[PDB]
Design an enzyme around this catalytic site. Structure first.
Site, PDB file in Angstrom:
ATOM      1  N   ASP A  56      14.695  61.208  31.135  1.00 60.29           N
ATOM      2  CA  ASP A  56      14.155  60.491  32.219  1.00 60.29           C
ATOM      3  C   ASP A  56      14.917  59.503  32.353  1.00 60.29           C
ATOM      4  O   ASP A  56      16.029  58.161  31.375  1.00 60.29           O
ATOM      5  CB  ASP A  56      13.014  59.599  30.899  1.00 60.29           C
ATOM      6  CG  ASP A  56      12.066  59.259  32.118  1.00 60.29           C
ATOM      7  OD1 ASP A  56      12.453  59.035  33.274  1.00 60.29           O
ATOM      8  OD2 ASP A  56      11.148  58.612  31.593  1.00 60.29           O
ATOM      9  N   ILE A  75       7.602  52.569  24.281  1.00 56.16           N
ATOM     10  CA  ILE A  75       7.481  53.270  22.928  1.00 56.16           C
ATOM     11  C   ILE A  75       8.049  51.435  21.868  1.00 56.16           C
ATOM     12  O   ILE A  75       9.188  51.327  22.358  1.00 56.16           O
ATOM     13  CB  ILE A  75       9.178  54.651  22.137  1.00 56.16           C
ATOM     14  CG1 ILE A  75      10.573  53.900  23.128  1.00 56.16           C
ATOM     15  CG2 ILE A  75       8.166  55.849  22.891  1.00 56.16           C
ATOM     16  CD1 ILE A  75      11.124  54.911  22.572  1.00 56.16           C
ATOM     17  N   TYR A 101       8.412  59.147  19.216  1.00 53.81           N
ATOM     18  CA  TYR A 101       7.338  59.698  19.831  1.00 53.81           C
ATOM     19  C   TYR A 101       6.645  60.607  18.398  1.00 53.81           C
ATOM     20  O   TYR A 101       5.431  61.275  18.721  1.00 53.81           O
ATOM     21  CB  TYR A 101       7.822  60.930  21.099  1.00 53.81           C
ATOM     22  CG  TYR A 101       8.457  60.810  21.537  1.00 53.81           C
ATOM     23  CD1 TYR A 101       6.953  60.185  23.028  1.00 53.81           C
ATOM     24  CD2 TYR A 101       9.392  60.044  22.546  1.00 53.81           C
ATOM     25  CE1 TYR A 101       7.309  59.772  23.833  1.00 53.81           C
ATOM     26  CE2 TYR A 101       9.444  59.207  23.565  1.00 53.81           C
ATOM     27  CZ  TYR A 101       9.402  59.448  24.635  1.00 53.81           C
ATOM     28  OH  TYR A 101       9.191  59.139  26.022  1.00 53.81           O
TER      29      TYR A 101
END
Length: 242
Positions: A56, A75, A101
């Site tokens: 990304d 995050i 994550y």
């Protein structure tokens, strides 16, 4: 290997000091202040896995990535990592799954318990436009501790500091009712901003002419009509009305 420097020489900036987030400055930014909680931040990033593959980046959207910091819109590693950056600074981040994550990962590119790499540039940071009108701008000095927020008619206890373009005019600890700041010589803005504040929250407030004292001004404080004011509000304790 681009991930090598941040993995071995990276400074640990985690509160627990568990090496969850490691940081290396590549380009030094300009200024002194780091972005605060709630502040609107503009960035350009590039995310790479432990194997080296990119997953990304904001550049393939052809625009800067924008979010509120400290609100968990990104995050955890970003929330902390960016809060240590300066305007124009570029840095590298090595983030453990606990700050990324986790065990679940992210479909379809992020695997389970993944350690990640991030190159973020802090393009610009602005205050929190509380009512999307630029009327009241908040910059949080300190996070609060509250499940709830003071409502209209709520009795409050706050420390209040108010200046007029650099001349301080009001300093005191006040106890009053939300909606009725007028009685205690307090602008409508404070009362409007308290509704979006937590217990023990310190923040600086830039009031527009509409949320200041208005066309009337404030003579006892020596404030002219429609003046822009700067307040420090510290919500100590409150009790909501029915």
């Amino acid at each position: 290997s681009p991930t090598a420097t941040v993995a071995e020489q990276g400074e640990d900036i985690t509160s627990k000091k568990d090496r969850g987030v490691l940081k290396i400055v590549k380009r030094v930014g300009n200024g002194e202040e780091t972005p605060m909680i709630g502040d609107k931040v503009y960035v350009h990033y590039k995310g790479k896995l432990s194997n080296g593959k990119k997953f990304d980046s904001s550049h393939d959207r052809n625009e800067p990535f924008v979010f509120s910091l400290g609100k968990g819109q990104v995050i955890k590693a970003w929330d902390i990592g960016v809060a240590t950056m300066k305007k124009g600074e570029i840095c590298h981040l090595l983030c453990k799954p606990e700050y990324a994550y986790g065990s679940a990962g992210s479909l379809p590119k992020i695997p389970s318990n993944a350690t990640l790499f991030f190159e973020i540039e802090l393009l610009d940071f602005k205050g929190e436009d509380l009512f999307e009108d630029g009327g009241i701008i908040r910059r949080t000095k300190r996070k609060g501790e509250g499940y709830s927020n003071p409502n209209e008619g709520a009795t409050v206890e706050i420390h209040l500091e108010g200046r007029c373009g650099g001349r301080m005019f009001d300093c005191r600890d006040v106890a009053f009712t939300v909606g009725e700041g007028e009685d205690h010589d307090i602008p409508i803005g404070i009362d409007k901003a308290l509704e979006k504040m937590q217990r023990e929250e310190q923040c600086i407030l830039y009031l527009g002419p509409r949320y200041g004292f208005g066309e009337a001004g404030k003579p006892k404080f020596g404030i002219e009509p429609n003046a822009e004011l700067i307040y420090e509000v510290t919500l100590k304790s409150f009790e909501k009305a029915k």
